[PDB]
Design a protein around this nucleic acid. Structure first.
Ligand code: ZZW
Ligand code: ZZW
Ligand code: MG
Ligand code: MG
Ligand code: MG
Ligand code: MG
Ligand code: NH4
Ligand code: NH4
Ligand code: ZN
Ligand code: ZN
Lengths: 368, 184, 368, 184
DNA sequence: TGCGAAATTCCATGACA
DNA sequence: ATTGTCATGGAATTTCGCA
DNA sequence: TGCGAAATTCCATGACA
DNA sequence: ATTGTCATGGAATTTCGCA
């Protein structure tokens, strides 16, 4: 502060203050003559207050804050003190947007067998049809084979009724769902345990995670739309048709329909493939086992030029889920406990609870 | 002649009347001829209407080339014929009073009748809820003749519910008298 | 049809049918033995019907439809007949998504002078504050200088009251707005004509077009949010503070605040720039005129690898604005009348009205 | 001494009472010293309160280093002083009974009083609506002494409303008698 | 006539619904 | 008859202080 | 042993809110 | 304690029919 500036005025060299400029006293303040003009050098003990005043005018970032300060003042390493404050402005930290992208997405392995994993989810509400408003969609991970059930609500109770019917056919090892009320209820937990089914949940507010079924929702809605053109939206009676239509549709990259992947032979539907007519069922199942293993699997894409990847101990902020109007879009900083994979983490949320969270709902806290 | 395949033929039949369960009285039974895979559907009556409703569910999963039945009224109605024609399903009837399926199917239908009876006694009214488990049992039951369960033949994989206990299926001395008390 | 197939069966060469395969009769149908197996060659007169049946199962695109047909049939140039039908399926055309991106955005020139162009727009509704729910935002194009007015509704009447106050200061050549009810009313048209102000409108449902003000909305909401952290959302009393705060904030790329661009000198606000203290006002205005002309202007970015650009006469489809549930997202095909610029067109909408439309709300009709 | 600049000094004063217009009675007048630019604000009273409300609008656009006024009650209240202190605005008063501005400002204030009077007669009650146009007039009026209008000096550009008619500003023989009829 | 560090510039990222 | 924009904070690049 | 055209594969684009 | 997906239709590339 005042000692530093004193020793300065009598022409002695201080580290930080270049020796080649002339430093003087005027109006009771230490000044210096810099290329752009004459600036006041405040005593170190005044600088935090100054940076703060500059920052608070519009809660500006690095350069916009600096440009205000440089109008009146000069000192060594101004931006270093600016950044110090930026990293302590609770309001900037929770309100500003991130300018760093998530790391490149994972492409999880395809389930090995039909019935290894289901992905389930609700669609709706839809225009009422026979008093029904939702559709439960169940997608077998390996085959894409899909079952559709109309419901009155996205309830546990309607979920259980429908799956009891479905699982008459086979019981899956795992059911993967999002964190909807329907699937996180303890009634559903019990229903699953009873049958040796393991429940797997998406990280919160991250539908990419149910990508398998979300994507199937698209085809379902899209086909329903086409079939309903110029008629009233009576979708109830079309679910069975849509189900069948989609299970028997080729995926051009795979060159197989989900039905084929499930049974290894077309049923009596239009344009049934006849290629295995001369094989025994056993020979057919043998060629099926082989088809199922050799299916195209996509790989993780290139990272974008400015992505971030989580590191244990990092300060990171979770996205506020349903932010009220004029309220911050981010939670307070929290710490990366465990890095489950490059796109999934456990954080301690300052309360602090453990939360398992997608990096897509995170930003790395700025300015360390 | 080309080898027998799943969806080649579905053998259908009704079972009942049964004691009311959640308002249902009958069971439509569907057995795939090649695999022995069984689907069950609870109905309120052995009508063409109830058959059509039930097969509409099943045929939205897989469509059989041929359905085989006895000459039950529900199956010989021209409505049911109209229904099958719409889906390109050939209808096939056994001659009256002389039902024929195949060994596999006859044996399968026997298991179903017996399995139902065993589980209905003690709880003659709670069978609606039990249909799912009945089916998993039947479909994960080992076929002495083939090396495989119907599950295995339909899907080409082991099941996550292997029914390791080849069961009694026979009425225990207790259940014999419990059944002679329900009829009285 | 039957003549073609007849001449074929007796071993004569027909253009399209390769000579090296054996063609024969069986079950009353012409067949052929192709590497993948034996396929029925239907008579040309049957083919349209077949493609149609295949397509209608799930309303599938090129390859997914082909793969069904190839199960039973073979003929010359199958995909050509498939595509013919795809381009005639009204339902696919209006329901499917586009897979071609818009051409790269335009970066219009900055208005030359303050008051050449205003961009105006409403924000809201907001939590009620003193009985007010919206904010009218007025952004001078050249300077970024912004005026804020609280209103009870996004009405013409509140717009007129506010602008009468604003234009006490200066009258602009042009006011640019979106197609909100407030600005398209004839009462507003009259109010503008009365003052020699020209009204310019964004293409419909394309806020990029009011980008100047939309972007300013962001800063306004963002600063309001920060100031309101941990207090109730009483924003009314903060508009004046926000207005002042933002007009006096540096844009790091420009190195000027909007206030500086408007007046060429800081008023008595914190950290006022003192650089022109020794210039005469006239010298100051001279350096201002020069600063205003040399400001950074961004250029049109590179096109993405699969973009489209509109051509006069092209069949194109306008996006449905507020599509009902399970209803198509596109209007019926319509024709590009005039290409106003590479990102803006006039189309004739089959009714047909002339509509001026952004290419972002258009797709090029598939399969010609 | 450094050259005179906009925002160096704002000269403020009240005009009125006037005939009620939309419930307003007075006009706060603000003139920038260097440019001669004029802002007008309608008030209900010459109070500290109305002055603060009005200057709050203006000072959310530009803040003057110094405000100059006569010793009107509204300007000498300690509330108004408190207000100016908060914005780092130095207050400056002319001595009582001896108002001094500058030639430019005195001349400008004269134009304002005369311009108002001219337009009020015939419509003494409709002046609230006329304030915007009054201002554009005053601010796009050529200064004989400087080569430029206040608009030009404030913004460094020509205006889209140049007031080409250097106007009469004097009362026509008709308006003279129309004004001697309103007072009666 | 070149080094280390600071200052400045560049620019992907995301948000105005 | 019209058309995206620009704060932001790490990283890249340039300039500075000294020799 | 290479040409023109057809078939197949590749893959950016956008949508499941 | 978990993780994007895949129909689509022009364009790129490969294969076919013939020589
Ligand atoms: O099932 C759900 N909740 O229970 C659910 C929630 C959302 C959602 C929320 C906000 C924005 C878009 C959203 N999408 C469409 C989507 C689907 C898949 C993607 F990868 C990306 C987006 C959803 C789908 N399903
Ligand atoms: O002013 C408006 N209507 O009158 C209006 C309408 C929208 C809007 C509609 C749908 C989705 C987003 C939208 N945004 C945010 C936005 C802003 C600028 C962009 F470039 C892109 C998006 C809007 C802003 N303003
Ligand atoms: Mg869901
Ligand atoms: Mg979903
Ligand atoms: Mg708007
Ligand atoms: Mg807007
Ligand atoms: N995986
Ligand atoms: N332009
Ligand atoms: Zn801040
Ligand atoms: Zn179609």
């Amino acid at each position: 502060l005042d000692a530093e500036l004193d020793q300065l005025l009598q022409g002695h060299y201080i580290k930080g203050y270049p020796k080649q400029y002339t430093y003087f006293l005027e109006d009771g303040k230490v000044k210096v003559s810099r290329p752009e003009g004459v600036k006041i050098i405040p005593p170190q003990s005044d600088r935090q207050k100054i940076v703060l005043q500059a920052h608070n005018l519009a809660h500006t970032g690095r350069e916009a804050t600096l440009l205000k300060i440089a109008n009146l003042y000069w000192w060594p390493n101004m931006r270093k003190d600016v950044v110090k404050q930026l990293g302590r402005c609770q309001q900037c930290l929770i309100t500003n947007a991130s300018n760093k992208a998530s790391g490149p997405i994972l492409r999880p392995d395809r389930p090995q067998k039909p019935f290894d994993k289901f992905f389930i989810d609700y669609i709706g509400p839809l225009p009422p049809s026979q008093g029904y408003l939702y559709v439960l969609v169940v997608v077998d991970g390996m085959t894409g084979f899909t079952w559709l059930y109309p419901t009155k609500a996205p309830s546990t109770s309607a979920t259980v009724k429908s799956l009891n019917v479905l699982t008459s056919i086979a019981i899956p090892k795992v059911i993967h769902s999002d964190q909807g009320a329907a699937f996180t209820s303890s009634t559903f937990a019990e229903w699953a345990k009873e049958r040796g089914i393991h429940l797997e949940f998406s990280t919160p507010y991250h539908p990419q995670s149910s990508g398998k079924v979300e994507r199937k929702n698209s085809d379902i809605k899209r086909l329903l739309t086409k079939l309903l053109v110029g008629r009233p939206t009576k979708w109830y009676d079309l679910l069975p048709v849509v189900q069948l239509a989609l299970n028997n549709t080729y995926s051009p990259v795979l060159k197989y329909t989900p039905h084929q992947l499930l049974f290894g032979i077309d049923s009596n539907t239009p344009f049934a493939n006849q290629d295995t007519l001369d094989l025994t069922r056993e020979e057919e199942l043998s060629l099926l086992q082989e088809i199922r293993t050799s299916l195209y699997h996509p790989s993780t894409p290139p990272a974008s030029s400015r992505s971030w990847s989580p590191v244990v101990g990092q300060l990171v902020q979770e996205r506020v889920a349903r932010p009220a109007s004029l309220r911050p879009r981010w939670h307070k900083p929290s710490t990366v406990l465990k890095v489950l994979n490059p796109r999934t983490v456990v954080i301690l949320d300052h309360l602090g609870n453990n939360r398992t969270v997608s990096i897509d709902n995170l930003k790395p806290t700025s300015h360390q | 002649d080309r080898p027998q395949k799943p969806f080649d033929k579905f053998f259908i039949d009704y079972i009942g009347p049964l004691p009311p369960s959640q308002g249902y009285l009958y069971v439509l039974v569907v057995v795939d001829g090649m695999t022995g895979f069984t689907w069950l559907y609870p109905t309120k009556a052995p009508s063409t209407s109830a058959t059509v409703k039930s097969l509409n569910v099943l045929t939205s999963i897989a469509i059989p080339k041929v359905i085989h039945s006895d000459q039950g009224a529900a199956f010989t109605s021209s409505t049911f014929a109209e229904w099958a024609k719409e889906r390109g399903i050939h209808l096939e009837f056994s001659t009256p009073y002389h039902p024929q399926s195949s060994g596999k199917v006859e044996r399968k239908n026997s298991d179903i009748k017996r399995l139902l009876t065993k589980l209905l006694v003690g709880r003659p009214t709670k069978w609606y809820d039990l249909l799912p488990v009945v089916q998993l049992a039947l479909n994960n039951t080992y076929s002495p003749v083939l090396k495989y369960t119907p599950h295995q033949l339909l899907f080409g994989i082991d099941s996550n519910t292997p029914f390791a206990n080849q069961d009694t299926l026979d009425l225990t001395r207790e259940e014999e008298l419990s059944l002679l008390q329900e009829i009285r």
